[PDB]
Design an enzyme around this catalytic site. Structure first.
Site, short mmCIF file in Angstrom:
data_model
loop_
_atom_site.label_atom_id
_atom_site.label_comp_id
_atom_site.label_asym_id
_atom_site.label_seq_id
_atom_site.Cartn_x
_atom_site.Cartn_y
_atom_site.Cartn_z
N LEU A 58 0.83 -1.19 0.00
CA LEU A 58 0.00 0.00 0.00
C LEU A 58 0.87 1.26 0.00
CD1 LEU A 58 -2.71 -1.12 2.57
CD2 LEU A 58 -2.62 -1.50 0.11
N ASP A 59 0.24 2.39 -0.29
CA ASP A 59 0.90 3.68 -0.27
C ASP A 59 0.39 4.52 0.89
OD1 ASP A 59 0.45 2.58 -3.06
OD2 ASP A 59 2.08 4.01 -3.45
N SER A 60 1.01 5.66 1.12
CA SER A 60 0.66 6.52 2.23
C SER A 60 -0.81 6.94 2.18
CB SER A 60 1.56 7.75 2.25
OG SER A 60 2.12 7.86 0.97
N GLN A 71 -3.01 4.09 3.25
CA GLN A 71 -3.06 4.02 4.71
C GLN A 71 -4.07 5.01 5.27
OE1 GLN A 71 -1.95 5.74 7.63
NE2 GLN A 71 -1.90 3.94 8.96
#
Ligand SMILES: CCCCCCCCCCCCCCCCCC(=O)OC[C@H](COP(=O)([O-])OCC(O)COP(=O)([O-])OC[C@@H](COC(=O)CCCCCCCCCCCCCCCCC)OC(=O)CCCCCCCCCCCCCCCCC)OC(=O)CCCCCCCCCCCCCCCCC
Ligand SMILES: CCCCCCCCCCCCCCCCCC(=O)OC[C@H](COP(=O)([O-])OCC[N+](C)(C)C)OC(=O)CCCCCCCCCCCCCCCCC
Ligand SMILES: CCCCCCCCCCCCCCCCCC(=O)OC[C@H](COP(=O)(O)OCCN)OC(=O)CCCCCCCCCCCCCCCCC
Ligand SMILES: NC(=O)C1=CN([C@@H]2O[C@H](COP(=O)(O)OP(=O)(O)OC[C@H]3O[C@@H](n4cnc5c(N)ncnc54)[C@H](OP(=O)(O)O)[C@@H]3O)[C@@H](O)[C@H]2O)C=CC1
Ligand code: SF4
Ligand code: SF4
Ligand code: SF4
Lengths: 176, 288, 114, 72, 206, 94, 111, 386, 154
Positions: free
Chosen positions: D32-34, D37
């Site tokens: 996943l990416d920021s 999240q």
């Protein structure tokens, strides 16, 4: 120097107080306003009977453009492009080349009448009275395209209106 | 290519697409999308119209200055047809009517008129010809509409062998007579979006392969008619004998004919656009 | 290399504001789709938000990031207060623009532009 | 808690149940990416009906860390 | 001399004296003071001095520049700080005008002067809108002149005259749409500058 | 101009004025629409001598700003205080 | 006086007393400024000049003429403004040296 | 509750369009948020692509009710940078038509204010007077509105023979027309109920909010640029500056009506003091030569050619020049870079700061009062948006 | 048959051109000349063109001034709410095709990019009389309509 528009003391004597009570209760200043509109009812109206009567104009009036000729029939325009340079709206487009007889004449002369601001700078700038703003103002159209004048349209305008245009220039040229 | 019709620009309103198209039937449901798409990219569009100029006004803003030209024409006057197509490189025939009238029957609008347009277009040297037929055209249909669609489809091919014939299913869109028809009131339907049909027509003009071919424009999914009508009433939060017969004809499956995919168009699901059409009136299982 | 900050004194402070703005945009999309009666879905709207954020993901100047957040908040305020109209919201999606060629051959056929 | 947290995380489209472990890292393991999240935490704020400040949310990098945070 | 604008040395001297006065009192901020040949006083200051200098000019008894005539910006791309912020103030008590100038770039904010002049509120919104200069601590900073969602700052010298997009109504989507600008007639750029020097008095050193 | 005498009295009484003396409609008091030609004067630079342009060149008399202070005793105000205005003697109070 | 003539500016019953207090407060505040600061030297000079006129002239009309600051209530308003400025000047300290020089060509026109 | 006012009234109105977003509690207005830019046409950027002469017509179209006054402001700014002086006759003509323009503006301001409040009839009476003044514009310039008559260096053409007589005949009767207007409004108790104590602004606030013109004098501030910073020949005419006492809509209305009377008083002096002479500066490097000269003299032809193609170069410099326009202080911050095109032209529209004060002035008033307050500011969105 | 349809067209055309209720979009300086057409000298009311008309009661929209991008969606909305028959008169250079501001980043280059236009009135501004000529020209356009003639032959 200055003056006061609303710096007045109402008198508090009984006579003056009763003048204001009479105005309040009997609507005197409202009746006065009705008198003014009644007087207008009986005045001759200012309306004119257009299109049978027309609003007054002067020789200087800036109307529809036209391209002019000399008395011999030769075009006055020699494609100098001063009108195109000065035009505040960039409404004028010109191309030129030597004519078959060697004359300096335009092959394109367009005025986008929907860009034009009808300011008359072109006719001020023209050195030979070639482009003018004529007296016509009744040339509304049903399509946008009809207001993109090319050289043939402007020359036809000149031939159509020259009789009036020449007299108007005769009337105003000593002020220029 | 004539120098005046070499494409120029970036494909926008002021560009030059090189297309000079005469669109018969331009004042209708399909015609307004075709003209819009042609005008978006700076094509010259000739719009012959039978109606009052007031009814053509919605087409005026669709092109740059001078790009939409209007003409008078009569279906039974071939000279008026010739004047309209004389300078065109493509002729698109969208003429049609969902009912018959005193002056024009289904044979007039779907046979005699398309044939006359195709014949004059060929005699005028027109290079491309687009003709809209119908997916369920058949000379054995209970519908006089679909019977005439079949006869006219045959005459157009005979007259203009290089014609591109397009056979759409019932078309749905803001101005349709399909989803609006149901919202105002066995069989399997494959409705197709108006913008997909429009894009396919535009691509058939630009595609040299489409010449001489017959296409079938259908939507992605097939719906039982009952499920479709229930879906419309749900989204909406809620005629003639011929029209009922057409609506109850099951959409023919013609796998041999090329479709939208062959013209680079992706068929739009009905569920994606159903709300758009029916919002003003305030998911069906498909058949695999 | 000594400059007056806008809001954030370093990238870590700046990235906090970016995340706060993303949260606000993320929660706003369902209301925007309803208020403006958009034909796009909520997933399409949230995907558009992600794409706009992603295109600026390479910035390393906290001042530039501050300005991007300042502008993003202004855009959100226009949308929430319904100062925008339906056309303004849909301008993010370019629906009437025909896809422009990407590869060399497609561009070569259609014009001179690189 | 833990059952509720995983329910949301399984319901997250970008995550597959196969690689979803209670100790999996949202970045290294699940990829996943920021912004993913941040999207996950917004779902947690919805499941449990309370707010999670960005300073707290920036450390919850595994499902178990979310479990621990909710308990406190 | 009928065609030549007459000089006014008395006002030139008064404004010069007041220019030194301001420089002596605010040496922390004042970088330059000049009086134009048509008698206009300009105080060039460091951007940190906007609030102190403006407050002084508003409230000092020998100044009393109570009216903010105009607040605007000028874009000079060749300068490291391309934006010049110009405050035109008026003093009714002393029947005089003063001009205060500072500078900034794309990323450096300027303190909002709304606390000194309430008039500044919209002037600063316009500068932000048209030039992209950010004003710190502005109560309500947002576009004021351009359309909603407009990208860029049109008064920057490097913003094209006709912009990047234009609007039309599209029947297919039944709304006004924005598309890349194409012009039927491109604006015709003119090169007007004469190759001969006009004003020797302003010649710059080689 | 052509109102009957009774109508003139009625609208004069209702308005409380002598409207007939200042009619808003123009009649023959206005200037003729054809005028004699003008003969306009010429400016003061229309001379045959003693008229060198360098003696009447306003543009070239402009100078760059005087620099009073560059970062390269009695107090003063930018000008003397403005003098208090006088009340109109033509009509001080409306 | 019935009115000052300016909307929102109330008449002052005791203008001589009000000015004496305000000018004394200004001189008190200026004492916290360095002796060499030009602001203190100039503000004290003009403040003392006006304070002397207030003491010399007990006629408001003749005092207004001497001060040349409009109505007496305008003078009082200006004194309140100067006192407010004096307090702010103490925190700004504008008598300090120039905070920073501009880039070399910052104020060069034309370019 | 939140409410948005309509773009414009349902009768012809020429102020432009405004989006007013308001917050209400019952009848009372709690917040006003004008949303402008609906007539933003990037005039200030377009001017940078024009010569100084080419940019002059843009100023007709700012406050397009005060055309020649806007021309005067721009002309004065360029004349200052050029360091030249227009001839005395042109200055008198500029003052004469400046005050005719003030009459045009004040008729529009007062009568459309009344028309929006519901008093329709005076608009019709006084617009017949406006129509006659349009004829004066047309007789000097050939255009009823956007004359482009006042230019740097003077005016474009001399008055035609017989024009001043006609201006006298018009002026002779105009005060009677004002009296009829005052009969309808000044003492009317309905008019006073709509204006008295509405939109009060203190003298102190008016200054800090950037107000000018009648928006200052209505509050008792004794200020008028024609008196304090005179330009052209305003120092040579006698007139009084009307001053308000309550700072409300009614006093500002009285100030505008009295200013019309003073404009007639000034026009009277202009008609009698008009001097002879040339009407544009006798410097052919700034003002084009006469057409007869252009067609006979080599120097004149060159200068005509260059003035209408390149235009005159202006020495480098910046000026803020302001005038007392009918709506207030109208100024230009004009930057010259030495060439024949302005580098920057910021326009100071008096209505810009006035409209920014709408929220302040409308506090504690009702919705219908917002219409009255917009009218008393006399807002035209050509100058607000530019 | 054809005679009855021909006269009904004349009657309805007469009624519509004799009762033209205009919605004026007073956008800029052209609106001033529009007000002068309502003023006594021309009195457009005397032709049946009412002074005050609500947008939902209007038959003709007059676009009197520059159309900006910011304003274009609102103008289209008003046009879309107009009940039919509806006509648009474009007045002045700005509305006709951008005029003085044609090359501006913020201006629509002619209102006919937003709405269909029936009459283009040229000028900057057109005089009040030129506008009145345009309205009279629209009346004669309505006089030439053959709505029932077309319908009968369908
Ligand atoms: C129901 C009532 C209506 C039906 C009864 C009809 C009454 C008779 C109307 C006849 C008017 C004909 C006038 C005329 O000859 O035209 C002159 C005209 C040429 O005259 P002109 O050269 O222009 O000069 C006119 C004057 O110089 C300039 O005009 P002027 O105003 O100076 O004078 C015109 C004259 C015209 O007066 C009349 O004839 C009508 C008098 C009855 C008034 C009815 C109310 O007025 C008078 O002489 C004043 C005395 C009349 C009584 C006025 C009382 C006013 C009210 C008092 C104050 C209270 C206010 C509250 O010729 C025409 O154009 C004929 C046009 C016909 C128009 C129709 C008139 C008939 C009305 C309809 C009848 C039913 C169908
Ligand atoms: C219910 C009964 C309806 C009565 C219809 C009244 C028609 C009157 C009329 O048309 O005026 C003559 C009109 C007046 O002509 P006009 O309207 O074209 O122009 C008149 C001249 N101007 C405009 C310059 C003043 O004549 C016609 O134009 C023919 C239209 C007849 C319409 C009647 C249909 C039957
Ligand atoms: C109606 C027709 C127009 C009449 C002309 C107007 C007129 O002359 O009236 C003006 C007159 C003076 O009133 P005003 O100037 O306001 O001063 C205060 C009172 N002297 O004011 C009046 O005298 C008007 C008196 C009105 C009387 C009351 C009417 C009551 C109606 C019911 C009976
Ligand atoms: N819509 C659908 O679902 C499908 C449509 N098609 C075909 O698509 C084409 C157009 O579809 P659509 O646009 O919906 O049809 P429309 O009825 O919406 O448009 C019909 C067009 O034909 C013109 N027309 C009709 N009769 C005549 C006539 N007698 N003489 C001259 N012109 C005439 C109309 O002009 P006026 O406006 O003057 O009447 C109009 O422009 C038709 O050929 C139709 O059969 C095929 C399959 C499905
Ligand atoms: S009148 Fe003005 S805008 Fe029109 S073509 Fe001539 S110079 Fe250009
Ligand atoms: S019209 Fe006149 S100014 Fe224009 S190109 Fe021809 S000669 Fe030159
Ligand atoms: S066309 Fe001329 S008068 Fe009309 S709005 Fe545009 S600039 Fe103003």
């Amino acid at each position: 120097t200055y003056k006061y528009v609303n710096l007045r003391e109402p008198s508090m004597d009984m006579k003056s107080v009763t003048d204001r009570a009479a105005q309040t209760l009997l609507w005197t200043e409202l009746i006065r306003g009705l008198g003014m509109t009644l007087s207008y009812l009986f005045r001759e109206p200012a309306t004119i009977n257009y299109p049978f009567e027309k609003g007054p104009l002067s020789p200087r009036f800036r109307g529809e453009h036209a391209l002019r000729r000399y008395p011999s029939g030769e075009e006055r325009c020699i494609a100098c492009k001063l009108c195109e340079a000065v035009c505040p709206a960039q409404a004028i487009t010109i191309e030129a080349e030597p004519r078959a007889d060697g004359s300096r004449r335009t092959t394109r002369y367009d005025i986008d009448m929907t860009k034009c601001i009808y300011c008359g700078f072109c006719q001020e700038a023209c050195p030979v009275d070639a482009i003018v703003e004529g007296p016509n103002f009744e040339f509304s159209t049903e399509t946008h395209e009809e207001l993109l004048y090319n050289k043939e349209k402007l020359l036809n305008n000149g031939d159509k209106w020259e009789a009036e245009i020449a007299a108007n220039i005769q009337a105003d040229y000593l002020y220029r | 290519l004539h120098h005046a019709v070499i494409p120029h620009g970036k494909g926008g309103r002021s560009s030059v697409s090189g297309i000079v198209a005469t669109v018969f039937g331009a004042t209708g449901f399909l015609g307004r999308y075709v003209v819009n798409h042609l005008g978006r990219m700076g094509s010259q569009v000739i719009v012959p119209h039978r109606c009052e100029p007031y009814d053509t006004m919605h087409l005026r803003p669709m092109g740059d200055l001078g790009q939409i030209i209007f003409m008078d024409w009569n279906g039974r006057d071939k000279d008026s047809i010739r004047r309209a197509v004389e300078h065109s490189s493509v002729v698109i025939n969208l003429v049609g009517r969902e009912w018959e009238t005193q002056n024009f029957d289904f044979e007039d609008v779907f046979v005699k008129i398309p044939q006359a347009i195709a014949q004059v277009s060929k005699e005028a040297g027109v290079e491309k010809f687009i003709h809209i037929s119908h997916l369920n055209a058949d000379i054995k249909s209970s519908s006089k509409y679909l019977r005439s669609k079949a006869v006219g489809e045959k005459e157009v091919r005979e007259t203009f062998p290089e014609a591109t014939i397009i056979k759409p299913a019932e078309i749905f869109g803001r101005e349709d007579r399909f989803l609006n028809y149901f919202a105002n009131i066995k069989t399997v339907k494959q409705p197709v979006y108006i913008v997909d049909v429009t894009k396919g027509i535009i691509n058939a003009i630009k595609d040299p392969d489409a010449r001489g071919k017959t296409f079938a424009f259908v939507g992605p999914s097939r719906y039982l008619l009952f499920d479709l009508v229930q879906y419309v009433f749900a989204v909406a939060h809620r005629t003639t004998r011929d029209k009922v017969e057409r609506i109850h004809t099951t959409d023919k499956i013609l796998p041999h004919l090329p479709g939208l995919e062959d013209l680079g168009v992706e068929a739009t699901p009905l569920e994606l656009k159903a709300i758009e059409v029916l919002r003003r009136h305030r998911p069906a299982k498909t058949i695999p | 290399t000594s400059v007056k900050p806008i809001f954030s004194r370093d990238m870590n402070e700046a990235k906090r504001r970016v995340r706060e703005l993303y949260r606000a945009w993320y929660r706003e999309v369902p209301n925007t789709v309803h208020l403006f009666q958009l034909d796009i879905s909520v997933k399409q709207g949230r995907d558009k938000v992600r794409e706009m954020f992603k295109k600026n993901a390479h910035i390393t100047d906290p001042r530039v990031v501050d300005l991007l957040v300042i502008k993003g908040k202004m855009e959100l305020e226009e949308t929430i207060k319904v100062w925008k109209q339906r056309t303004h919201v849909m301008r993010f999606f370019h629906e009437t623009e025909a896809p422009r060629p990407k590869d060399f051959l497609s561009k070569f056929y259609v014009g001179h532009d690189p | 808690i833990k059952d509720r947290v995983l329910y949301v995380l399984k319901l997250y489209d970008k995550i597959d149940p196969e690689k979803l472990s209670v100790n999996s890292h949202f970045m290294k393991d699940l990829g996943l990416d920021s912004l993913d999240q941040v999207e996950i935490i917004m779902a947690m704020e919805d499941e449990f009906g309370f707010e999670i400040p960005d300073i707290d949310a920036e450390k919850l990098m595994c499902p178990q860390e979310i479990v621990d945070y909710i308990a406190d | 001399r009928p065609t030549v604008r007459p000089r006014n040395d008395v006002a030139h001297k008064q404004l010069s004296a007041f220019g030194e006065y301001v420089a002596e009192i605010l040496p922390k901020y004042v970088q330059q003071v000049q009086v134009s040949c048509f008698n206009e006083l300009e105080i060039c200051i460091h951007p940190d001095g906007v609030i102190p200098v403006l407050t002084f000019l508003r409230d000092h008894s020998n100044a009393q520049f109570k009216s903010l005539a105009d607040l605007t910006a000028v874009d000079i791309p060749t300068r490291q700080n391309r934006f010049e912020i110009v405050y035109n103030l008026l003093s009714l008590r002393f029947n005089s005008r003063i001009r205060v100038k500072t500078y900034t770039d794309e990323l450096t904010p300027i303190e909002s002067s709304v606390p000194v002049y309430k008039a500044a509120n919209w002037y600063e919104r316009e500068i932000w809108d048209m030039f992209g200069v950010f004003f710190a601590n502005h109560p309500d900073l947002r576009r004021i002149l351009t359309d909603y969602g407009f990208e860029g700052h049109p008064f920057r010298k490097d913003f094209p005259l006709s912009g990047y997009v234009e609007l039309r109504y599209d029947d297919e989507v039944k709304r006004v749409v924005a598309e890349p600008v194409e012009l039927a007639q491109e604006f015709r750029k003119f090169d007007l500058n004469s190759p001969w020097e006009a004003f020797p008095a302003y010649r710059q050193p080689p | 101009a052509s109102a009957t005498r009774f109508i003139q009295w009625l609208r004069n009484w209702a308005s409380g004025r002598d409207l007939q003396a200042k009619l808003q409609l123009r009649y023959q008091e206005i200037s003729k629409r054809t005028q004699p030609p003008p003969k306009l004067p010429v400016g003061p630079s229309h001379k045959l001598s003693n008229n060198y342009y360098c003696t009447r060149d306003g543009r070239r008399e402009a100078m760059p700003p005087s620099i009073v202070m560059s970062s390269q005793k009695k107090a003063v105000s930018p000008a003397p205080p403005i003098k208090r205005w006088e009340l109109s003697q033509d009509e001080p109070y409306l | 006086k019935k009115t000052t003539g300016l909307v929102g500016l109330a008449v002052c019953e005791t203008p001589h007393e009000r000015l004496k207090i305000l000018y004394t407060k200004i001189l008190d505040v200026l004492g916290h400024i360095p002796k060499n600061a030009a602001y203190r030297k100039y503000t004290e000079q003009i403040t003392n000049e006006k304070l002397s006129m207030v003491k010399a002239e007990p006629d408001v009309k003749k005092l207004e003429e001497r001060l040349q600051g409009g109505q007496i209530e305008e003078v009082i308003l200006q004194a309140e403004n100067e006192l407010s400025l004096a307090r702010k000047m103490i925190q700004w300290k504008p008598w300090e040296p120039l905070v920073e020089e501009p880039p070399a060509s910052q104020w060069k026109w034309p370019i | 509750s939140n409410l948005t006012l309509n773009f414009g009234p349902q009768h012809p109105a020429a102020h432009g369009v405004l989006r007013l977003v308001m917050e209400l509690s019952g009848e009372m207005v709690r917040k006003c948020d004008p949303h402008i830019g609906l007539l933003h046409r990037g005039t200030e950027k377009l001017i940078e692509y024009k010569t100084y002469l080419q940019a002059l017509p843009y100023f007709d179209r700012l406050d397009y009710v005060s055309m020649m006054c806007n021309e005067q402001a721009y002309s004065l700014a360029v004349e200052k940078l050029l360091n030249i002086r227009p001839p005395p006759r042109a200055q008198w003509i500029r003052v004469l038509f400046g005050e005719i323009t003030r009459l045009l503006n004040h008729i529009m301001a007062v009568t459309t204010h009344a028309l929006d409040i519901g008093a329709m009839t005076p608009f019709f009476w006084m617009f017949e007077e406006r129509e006659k003044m349009f004829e004066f514009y047309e007789r000097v310039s050939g255009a009823r509105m956007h004359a482009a008559y006042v230019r740097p260096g003077g005016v474009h053409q001399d008055l035609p023979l017989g024009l001043m007589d006609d201006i006298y005949e018009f002026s002779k009767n105009f005060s009677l027309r004002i009296d009829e207007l005052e009969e309808m409004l000044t003492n009317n108790r309905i008019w006073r109920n709509r204006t008295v104590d509405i939109g009060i602004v203190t003298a102190e606030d008016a200054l800090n909010y950037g107000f000018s013109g009648v928006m200052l004098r209505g509050s008792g501030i004794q200020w008028d640029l024609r008196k304090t910073q005179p330009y052209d020949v305003y120092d040579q005419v006698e007139f009084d500056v009307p001053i308000g006492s309550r700072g409300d809509c009614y006093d500002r209305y009285l100030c505008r009506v009295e200013e019309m009377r003073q404009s007639i008083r000034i026009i009277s002096q202009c008609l009698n003091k008009m001097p002879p002479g040339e009407i544009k500066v006798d410097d052919a490097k700034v003002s084009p030569p006469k057409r007869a000269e252009m067609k006979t003299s080599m120097e004149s032809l060159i200068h005509h050619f260059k003035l209408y193609t390149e235009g005159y170069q202006v020495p480098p410099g910046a000026t803020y020049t302001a005038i007392e326009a009918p709506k207030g202080e109208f100024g230009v911050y004009l930057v010259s870079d030495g060439s024949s095109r302005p580098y920057r032209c910021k326009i100071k529209a008096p209505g810009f700061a006035h409209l920014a004060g709408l929220d302040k002035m409308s506090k504690g008033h009702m919705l219908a009062d917002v219409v009255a307050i917009i009218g008393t500011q006399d807002i035209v969105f050509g100058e607000v948006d530019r | 048959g054809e005679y009855v349809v021909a006269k009904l067209d004349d009657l309805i055309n007469w009624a519509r051109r004799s009762s033209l209720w205009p919605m004026t979009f007073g956008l800029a300086c052209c609106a001033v000349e529009m007000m002068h057409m309502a003023a006594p000298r021309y009195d457009m009311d005397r032709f049946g063109v009412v002074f005050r008309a609500s947008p939902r009661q209007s038959d003709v929209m007059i676009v009197a001034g520059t159309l900006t991008n910011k304003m274009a969606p609102a103008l289209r909305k008003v046009y879309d709410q107009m009940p039919e028959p509806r006509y648009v008169v474009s007045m002045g250079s700005c509305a006709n095709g951008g005029g003085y501001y044609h090359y501006s980043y913020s201006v629509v280059r002619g209102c006919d990019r937003i709405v269909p236009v029936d009459i283009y009135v040229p000028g900057c501004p057109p005089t009040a009389e030129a506008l009145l000529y345009g309205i009279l020209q629209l009346q004669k356009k309505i006089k030439r309509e053959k709505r029932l003639r077309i319908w009968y032959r369908r």
